[PDB]
Write an enzyme that holds these catalytic residues in place. Structure first.
Site, PDB file in Angstrom:
ATOM      1  N   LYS A  59       2.030 -20.861 -35.844  1.00 43.56           N
ATOM      2  CA  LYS A  59       2.748 -19.571 -35.926  1.00 43.56           C
ATOM      3  C   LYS A  59       4.154 -19.770 -35.352  1.00 43.56           C
ATOM      4  CE  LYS A  59       1.291 -15.365 -37.258  1.00 43.56           C
ATOM      5  NZ  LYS A  59       0.479 -15.261 -38.546  1.00 43.56           N
ATOM      6  N   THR A  99      -3.712 -18.770 -38.103  1.00 41.46           N
ATOM      7  CA  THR A  99      -2.437 -18.647 -37.403  1.00 41.46           C
ATOM      8  C   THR A  99      -2.366 -17.303 -36.645  1.00 41.46           C
ATOM      9  OG1 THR A  99      -1.133 -17.717 -39.228  1.00 41.46           O
ATOM     10  CG2 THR A  99      -1.306 -20.165 -39.165  1.00 41.46           C
ATOM     11  N   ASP A 100      -2.979 -16.261 -37.199  1.00 42.47           N
ATOM     12  CA  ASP A 100      -3.132 -14.993 -36.450  1.00 42.47           C
ATOM     13  C   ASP A 100      -3.816 -15.178 -35.086  1.00 42.47           C
ATOM     14  OD1 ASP A 100      -2.803 -11.905 -36.897  1.00 42.47           O
ATOM     15  OD2 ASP A 100      -4.820 -12.134 -36.064  1.00 42.47           O
ATOM     16  N   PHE A 123      44.084 -36.639 -27.413  1.00 44.01           N
ATOM     17  CA  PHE A 123      43.417 -37.482 -28.398  1.00 44.01           C
ATOM     18  C   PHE A 123      44.429 -38.411 -29.095  1.00 44.01           C
ATOM     19  CE2 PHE A 123      41.010 -38.490 -32.393  1.00 44.01           C
ATOM     20  CZ  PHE A 123      39.996 -39.248 -31.793  1.00 44.01           C
ATOM     21  N   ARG A 178      46.111 -30.696 -26.301  1.00 44.38           N
ATOM     22  CA  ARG A 178      45.511 -29.847 -27.351  1.00 44.38           C
ATOM     23  C   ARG A 178      44.486 -28.911 -26.732  1.00 44.38           C
ATOM     24  NH1 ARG A 178      41.015 -33.823 -30.417  1.00 44.38           N
ATOM     25  NH2 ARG A 178      39.759 -34.137 -28.512  1.00 44.38           N
ATOM     26  N   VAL A 223      36.185 -36.128 -26.906  1.00 45.58           N
ATOM     27  CA  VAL A 223      34.904 -35.461 -26.673  1.00 45.58           C
ATOM     28  C   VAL A 223      33.887 -36.506 -26.205  1.00 45.58           C
ATOM     29  CG1 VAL A 223      33.000 -34.195 -27.797  1.00 45.58           C
ATOM     30  CG2 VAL A 223      35.362 -33.543 -28.265  1.00 45.58           C
ATOM     31  N   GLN A 224      33.881 -37.663 -26.887  1.00 47.60           N
ATOM     32  CA  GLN A 224      32.978 -38.787 -26.577  1.00 47.60           C
ATOM     33  C   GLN A 224      33.032 -39.147 -25.083  1.00 47.60           C
ATOM     34  OE1 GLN A 224      34.916 -38.490 -29.317  1.00 47.60           O
ATOM     35  NE2 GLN A 224      34.138 -39.718 -31.064  1.00 47.60           N
ATOM     36  N   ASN A 283      33.343 -30.045 -32.384  1.00 47.50           N
ATOM     37  CA  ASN A 283      34.703 -29.934 -31.943  1.00 47.50           C
ATOM     38  C   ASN A 283      35.281 -28.805 -32.788  1.00 47.50           C
ATOM     39  OD1 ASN A 283      37.311 -30.339 -30.985  1.00 47.50           O
ATOM     40  ND2 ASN A 283      37.488 -32.450 -31.752  1.00 47.50           N
ATOM     41  N   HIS A 290      38.021 -26.631 -34.051  1.00 51.76           N
ATOM     42  CA  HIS A 290      39.466 -26.896 -34.068  1.00 51.76           C
ATOM     43  C   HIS A 290      40.320 -25.632 -34.024  1.00 51.76           C
ATOM     44  CE1 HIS A 290      38.298 -30.962 -34.889  1.00 51.76           C
ATOM     45  NE2 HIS A 290      37.784 -30.655 -36.068  1.00 51.76           N
TER      46      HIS A 290
HETATM   47  O1  LIG Z   1      37.588 -35.948 -29.406  1.00 52.59           O
HETATM   48  C1  LIG Z   1      37.694 -36.233 -30.600  1.00 52.59           C
HETATM   49  N1  LIG Z   1      36.889 -37.201 -31.093  1.00 52.59           N
HETATM   50  C2  LIG Z   1      36.954 -37.570 -32.383  1.00 52.59           C
HETATM   51  O2  LIG Z   1      36.200 -38.456 -32.837  1.00 52.59           O
HETATM   52  C3  LIG Z   1      37.962 -36.889 -33.247  1.00 52.59           C
HETATM   53  N2  LIG Z   1      38.332 -36.975 -34.565  1.00 52.59           N
HETATM   54  N3  LIG Z   1      39.384 -35.959 -34.738  1.00 52.59           N
HETATM   55  N4  LIG Z   1      39.685 -35.248 -33.512  1.00 52.59           N
HETATM   56  C4  LIG Z   1      38.787 -35.864 -32.633  1.00 52.59           C
HETATM   57  N5  LIG Z   1      38.629 -35.559 -31.341  1.00 52.59           N
HETATM   58  O1  LIG Z   2      -3.124 -19.581 -45.865  1.00 53.39           O
HETATM   59  C1  LIG Z   2      -3.251 -19.341 -44.662  1.00 53.39           C
HETATM   60  N1  LIG Z   2      -3.398 -20.389 -43.822  1.00 53.39           N
HETATM   61  C2  LIG Z   2      -3.550 -20.205 -42.499  1.00 53.39           C
HETATM   62  O2  LIG Z   2      -3.672 -21.176 -41.724  1.00 53.39           O
HETATM   63  C3  LIG Z   2      -3.574 -18.800 -41.995  1.00 53.39           C
HETATM   64  N2  LIG Z   2      -3.706 -18.209 -40.765  1.00 53.39           N
HETATM   65  N3  LIG Z   2      -3.595 -16.762 -41.017  1.00 53.39           N
HETATM   66  N4  LIG Z   2      -3.413 -16.450 -42.420  1.00 53.39           N
HETATM   67  C4  LIG Z   2      -3.413 -17.736 -42.970  1.00 53.39           C
HETATM   68  N5  LIG Z   2      -3.250 -18.029 -44.264  1.00 53.39           N
HETATM   69 XE   LIG Z   3      33.482 -31.937 -24.175  1.00 48.00          XE
END
Ligand SMILES: O=c1[nH]c(=O)c2nn[nH]c2[nH]1
Ligand SMILES: O=c1[nH]c(=O)c2nn[nH]c2[nH]1
Ligand SMILES: [Xe]
Ligand SMILES: O=c1[nH]c(=O)c2nn[nH]c2[nH]1
Ligand SMILES: O=c1[nH]c(=O)c2nn[nH]c2[nH]1
Ligand code: NA
Ligand code: NA
Ligand code: NA
Ligand code: NA
Ligand SMILES: [Xe]
Ligand SMILES: [Xe]
Ligand SMILES: [Xe]
Lengths: 295, 295, 295, 295
Positions: free
Chosen positions: D10, D57-58, D159, D176, D227-228, D254, D256
């Site tokens: 679920k 699942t209920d 950069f 920047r 950033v790296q 990043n 921009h």
């Molecule tokens: O920090 C950055 N890393 C990148 O790889 C990059 N490429 N464009 N601007 C950038 N700035």
């Molecule tokens: O098709 C279904 N599978 C399930 O596992 C399930 N659980 N509730 N209703 C359901 N229907």
């Molecule tokens: Xe960062």
């Protein structure tokens, strides 16, 4: 401390390309969102402030546009492979490229029953995606997918015979609504490189179409015993129809529609066989996954 | 201080309804999101903590489900009118009801070329909406709309001859991409009450279809001089085809796709007649509105 | 057909501005999203494809940046008034400008107990907004607002004594959770023009602060008889503290948290006085509005 | 074909819990969104329509509420471990539980300088998360994270010295704006089971606080070379201060902010040392990741 893994690049690069047929006058558009992350001998940019190893993310953005100008952008499996291969070949110290592409729908409009040469409609939010990992010396791994395909059937879904214990309140049912958003991924056999990807180009669009068709038909026609059982049937058929796929993965929400008891109001009957008005539930939802491979 | 205006109710009420043809076995589904706000002699709930005048918002929610169980939910103009009329007739001190309905697409699936009896696809995020204001002694005012219809054309749009001054950098163009999300609203003549709305029921779906058709054809076929000029042409035609409409309003973003100059890279030509790869812009966007009426 | 109303312009223009104190070294940043729509003698651009009357939306975008470069951007009521006045004075045929501004929070970071000269955090999604309508010959109308202020109290909210009929299932309560997202708008007396707006500049930030303070204190301290009753108390106090405001409007969702009966499981007690675990409901929600003015 | 992997459960289960101090009258609220997926001997539900192996699942949803009623929900690392352990112990055929928890901020309001006993504000969209994987016979693996922490500094970011080739247009810069949304994850040493997790309970909140503090201070104080380089410094310090962490991972966009050349308009100076007004870019963005471990 030490760098155990690192990757960096540009995300959310929106690209549009148009093809104009000189003869017929017909135009075709493609629109995608692209993400490219690189790996290689780049640890010193993190540990020593050595920027000499960094291909600037702005330059990666430039490369995506240049590559789209010089190459076809369809099928996306081919475009992603070309783009990833570029980075590992061009830069000695870059050893892996990871390219994700989301393709947006621009469907040609029919006006008065015929197809328009240059007008398009976004006919669904459904996407076609690829993930391409190009790793120096290890070839090209491609996962293709469709996502955001939202379906509902109003009957011919059942759910009974599940485990019952002191945590169980759910009633067994022989007739319920079934609705989901389909996310399906097929993983190709590893390709040795760009020549091999080119040799299989016609299979990419055909396999996407087959995957879509099998998904829709199986959902419509299966008298579903559970989400688990129906999704398995879909994956089985896809593997059967394309030998170059190694695995198929489905990830499916179960989007619940609840009966509303109205008997408190003038004995109104709205449950079981009398159920007409339902309350769609935004949350929570079931989530069911499976990866199917060859035995 | 004094209460100058007040309204209250329930928002985001999700409703699904199914119709099951006993003979043919065919099922049809409708899914909507409904908002209902009431006005009347309710000031004392704000000023004196007098809750005796409040129809609880939970009860409004109950009423929407009961009303959907007992009445057709299509066309939405009729359902909204029934629902609004209920509140003003049932409660002496409530004098206005404001009902908004958003209809979600569940389009019947074609499997192997034929329509499936009980399986559906969300084939677009486009909505059909209504706003219905039911005011005691003043009848029923209905505005119908479509929204979220996203289109693009790759040529046959121009934009030149605009005002140029010391704030202008934009170049005139005779060939650009045009793309928008269409929001179109048509406002009906005031109806005296529910009997009159019922008398016009067949016009509601037909007018929605006409509005959609005119929008798409005009966009595809107009060699557009501007968004302003093309949208006017759409509104003119809708008013011409349905005499019971008093005004048509369009609200249209201009979603820009920018050329990318690549000449810095090996003299690559990608502008003007050579433009193939474009950069879609998420923001800012033009926003163009107009309300057209009868002269 | 005829044009009954028309407006057009640029939406979603993101702007950042920095102020650098030469002496102290302290920097302060402002970030906003701006929308400007114009009206005037522009009908012929719609009806006759006459672009000579159009100030291009790209030029409006340029003007916003130039105006921000040459003028203070705070308080936003002043910036919006300057920007709107520009258009009606510069262009003879433009007679109204409508400027909406959303201000985003960049709150100065405290590091080791002291305020940092140049580092900021988005400490909430709460916005401060203005809508400014500058109409030639009719002065300047300003509505200021706060929105996206999300609060919850876990007790000291009641809801009983409401109307009960055959549509009512809701039980009366003397102790419930109350949670909402606050949208509050105060509308200023009409100003004759830019000189008058300038004369009142110190009141704009002070009134925003007062409105915020009154909202939070009243919500925390009122033993609430209903959303209606509590919101009235807030609006009353704001009007009392600033004579230059004519009306205050609140629009408040009632975001429901439902008890969960767990008695089915080993007689576990989780309702009424024993309620500890609740299920927040995403939808539907109550929606309660009121506009309060002077008597 | 064969099932290679499967998990189901679920998602999007919203939970609120209140604690009421009997003595002081002070109340404290917790709100979370929980996802639980199970794995085990469940293949036959997919392949043979055998529902006897399915915990509905209920029922999983019910279990989350019951578990929250009977146990503390803080720190989330402990709650997730209790919840995951439940499923693998209760059901013989279930061998792994995967629990994800997102914690939402409800910060106690200060009214007139003192803390209110029962009123709260959502003071940021920042989240605290956990992912807990409980695997039968292999203990408990916990990854803790913070996300959605959005910061900006207006100077003291550089950069320059990056790789320049025929794909490079980006100019080197010594001053920047730097802005990002911080996603930081720390992975704990494997725990043998629930007793060991309980023995370390005080470390969970303390380590989250340290991670947050180091992130903010380093960002504010580092004259950033990239950033790296800055993100590496953050991760180094976290590993140094908590020996029970094995790895730290940062994922940073990043975001921009571009200079706007206004020289075309009356020689206005708005670039380099004169830059005051900038255009925030919604897309594309840089994306920079690194996982740092012990040497
Ligand atoms: O920090 C950055 N890393 C990148 O790889 C990059 N490429 N464009 N601007 C950038 N700035
Ligand atoms: O098709 C279904 N599978 C399930 O596992 C399930 N659980 N509730 N209703 C359901 N229907
Ligand atoms: Xe960062
Ligand atoms: O169609 C358009 N109308 C306008 O007002 C405008 N301004 N820039 N581009 C434009 N296109
Ligand atoms: O404060 C409230 N006002 C209302 O009108 C209402 N209706 N249900 N709960 C409610 N609470
Ligand atoms: Na390489
Ligand atoms: Na009435
Ligand atoms: Na004017
Ligand atoms: Na087990
Ligand atoms: Xe399914
Ligand atoms: Xe248009
Ligand atoms: Xe309130």
């Amino acid at each position: 401390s030490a760098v155990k893994a690192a990757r960096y690049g540009k995300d959310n690069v929106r690209v549009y390309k148009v093809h104009k047929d000189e003869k017929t006058g017909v135009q075709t558009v493609y629109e995608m969102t692209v993400c490219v992350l690189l790996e290689g001998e780049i640890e010193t940019s993190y540990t020593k402030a050595d920027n000499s190893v960094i291909v600037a993310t702005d330059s990666i953005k430039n490369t995506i546009y240049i590559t789209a100008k010089q190459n076809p952008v369809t099928p996306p499996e081919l475009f992603g492979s070309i783009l990833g291969t570029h980075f590992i070949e061009k830069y000695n110290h870059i050893h892996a490229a990871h390219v994700n592409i989301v393709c947006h729908r621009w469907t040609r409009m029919d006006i008065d029953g015929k197809p328009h040469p240059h007008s398009f409609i976004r006919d669904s939010e459904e996407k076609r995606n690829v993930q391409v990992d190009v790793v120096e010396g290890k070839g090209i791994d491609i996962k293709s997918s469709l996502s955001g395909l939202t379906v509902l059937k109003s009957t011919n879904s059942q759910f009974w015979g599940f485990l019952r214990d002191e945590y169980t309140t759910l009633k067994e049912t022989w007739d319920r609504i079934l609705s989901t958003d389909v996310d399906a991924t097929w993983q190709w056999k590893n390709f040795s490189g760009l020549q091999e990807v080119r040799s299989h180009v016609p299979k990419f669009d055909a396999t996407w179409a087959t995957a879509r068709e099998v998904t829709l038909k199986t959902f419509a026609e299966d008298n579903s015993a559970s989400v688990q059982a129906t999704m398995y049937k879909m994956a089985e058929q896809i593997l059967a129809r394309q030998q170059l796929i190694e695995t198929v993965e489905y990830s499916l929400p179960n989007k619940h529609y609840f009966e509303i008891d109205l008997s408190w109001h003038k004995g109104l009957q709205n449950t079981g066989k009398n159920a007409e008005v339902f309350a769609p539930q935004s949350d929570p939802n079931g989530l069911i996954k499976c990866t199917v491979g060859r035995s």
